[PDB]
């Protein structure tokens, strides 16, 4: 079934953006330098020895890329470290610290691997920004291909190009396109990780993210997961556009826990819980006058509270009139038995095991849009079941700050909280550094794939063996 190609306008926009990229001053890439051994004591030795070599003229004459390439081909032992560096000075200072077992922002170092697989966090609320995904789309052939694949599916489903949005700095995102585009980007980022050998042990979803979570847990084909986010997204945009003024439901974050909310809500009979986000943070929704009132009641009581700006009212009665069209649109999707674990924040945070019964039903998407997102509960259930590595696939890492609030509450004070892209951070670097972290903690990640195949020998270094 012939899928639409990249649009004319997208090609035009790409050309322009490449032209402009080609004119910025090239910045030195971030190179990851892996050092490992069966023993931490020996890992530090190799570190200090590599550093000593990099000090010498031969080592100063070798590119960081070559040193990283050689390093990446050593046997990767139980105890691991990666110094992420842009030049020789950075590299040496990082290695000094690995050797001294001292800490630094560009160094990661552990005595041994994390016991349980990573949980991939698929969220999206509040993570959008204007240029999101663009730079990685221009710079990374594997990302770009997956973006283009979702872009084709959305043209087919919805009639416009998400990739045109990504490329056009003049174009901003609204209720509908914000969602379909964060989705595109979640899909492509996860597949970029798969390409480098990463896998999720489990997923957890948060509202918009739930459809990407289904895909990566093998619960729906890419097509059907695109179908799920497309129906949610366009129906939500259309539904708000037809409502006016104080009939538009708002959302806000307030520093009250589930228990405090049952009390507080007796004053605000139309407020509902959108996302139980953290143990003492809840995104609530309803009529503006009640939202403003709960906001002021919080600010008064000495409690954090921030109103959001989106006339989306996911997880409120404002979704009531879309349920029927939603049900109708997703007739025909095929839920499949998952291939990894799922913490279902739609089902109150409950775990479904690889091999379980399909849970990606039409009724599932109906349930998820209308009802509360049990995010903190899902994350608590992961922590309690031995998971300690949380990786957010996002254009900006807002849900990991929520994850941290739950990990800490549950007694897990040193979780591995791994972000992907971020606004104000080079996207190619970010991915490097995310892959370095995965590698370091022992999770699947073929670190050889972080360097292109050697053509000649100057692509290697004479690293002290």
């Amino acid at each position: 079934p012939e899928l639409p190609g990249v649009t004319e306008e997208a090609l035009r926009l790409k050309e322009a953006a490449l032209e402009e990229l080609a004119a910025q001053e090239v910045t030195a890439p971030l190179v990851p330098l892996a050092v490992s051994a069966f023993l931490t004591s020996r890992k530090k030795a190799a570190a200090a020895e590599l550093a000593d070599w990099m000090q010498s003229p031969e080592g100063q004459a070798s590119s960081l890329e070559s040193i990283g390439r050689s390093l990446s081909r050593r046997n990767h032992g139980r105890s691991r470290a990666v110094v992420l560096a842009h030049d020789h000075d950075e590299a040496i200072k990082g290695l000094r610290a690995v050797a001294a077992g001292k800490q630094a922002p560009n160094v990661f170092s552990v005595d041994g691997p994390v016991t349980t697989g990573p949980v991939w966090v698929l969220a999206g609320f509040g993570a959008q920004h204007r240029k999101m995904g663009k730079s990685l789309y221009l710079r990374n052939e594997v990302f770009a291909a997956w973006i283009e694949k979702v872009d084709a599916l959305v043209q087919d489903e919805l009639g416009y190009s998400v990739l045109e949005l990504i490329l056009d700095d003049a174009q901003d995102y609204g209720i509908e396109t914000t969602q379909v585009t964060i989705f595109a980007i979640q899909i492509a980022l996860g597949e970029l990780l798969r390409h480098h050998g990463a896998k999720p042990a489990a997923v957890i979803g948060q509202s918009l993210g739930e459809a990407a979570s289904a895909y990566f847990a093998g619960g729906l084909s890419l097509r059907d997961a695109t179908r799920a986010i497309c129906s949610r997204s366009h129906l939500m945009g259309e539904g708000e556009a037809m409502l006016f003024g104080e009939y538009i439901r708002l959302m806000a974050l307030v520093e009250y826990s589930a228990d405090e909310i049952r009390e507080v809500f007796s004053d605000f009979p139309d407020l509902e819980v959108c996302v139980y986000a953290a143990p003492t943070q809840t995104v609530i929704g309803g009529p503006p006058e009640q939202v403003d009132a709960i906001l002021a009641r919080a600010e008064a009581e000495g409690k954090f509270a921030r109103k959001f700006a989106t006339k989306g009212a996911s997880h409120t009665s404002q979704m009531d009139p879309l349920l029927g069209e939603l049900t109708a649109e997703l007739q025909g999707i095929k839920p499949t038995s998952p291939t990894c674990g799922i913490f279902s924040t739609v089902h109150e945070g409950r775990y479904i095991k690889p091999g379980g019964e399909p849970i990606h039903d039409v009724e599932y998407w109906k349930k998820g849009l209308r009802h509360s997102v049990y995010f903190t509960h899902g994350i608590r259930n992961a922590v309690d079941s031995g998971h300690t590595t949380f990786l957010e696939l996002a254009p900006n890492p807002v849900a990991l700050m929520q994850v941290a609030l739950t990990t800490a509450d549950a007694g897990l004070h040193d979780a591995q909280l791994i972000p992907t892209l971020a606004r104000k951070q080079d996207e190619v670097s970010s991915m490097v550094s995310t892959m370095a972290q995965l590698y370091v903690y022992g999770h699947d990640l073929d670190i050889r794939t972080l360097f292109s195949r050697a053509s000649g020998p100057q692509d290697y270094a004479n690293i002290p063996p």
């Binding site: 922002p105 990991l400 700050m401 670097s429 550094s433 370095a436 972290q437």
Partner: peptide
Amino acid sequence: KENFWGMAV
């Protein structure tokens, strides 16, 4: 404040 290389802070 999550930094340069993936750090909650």
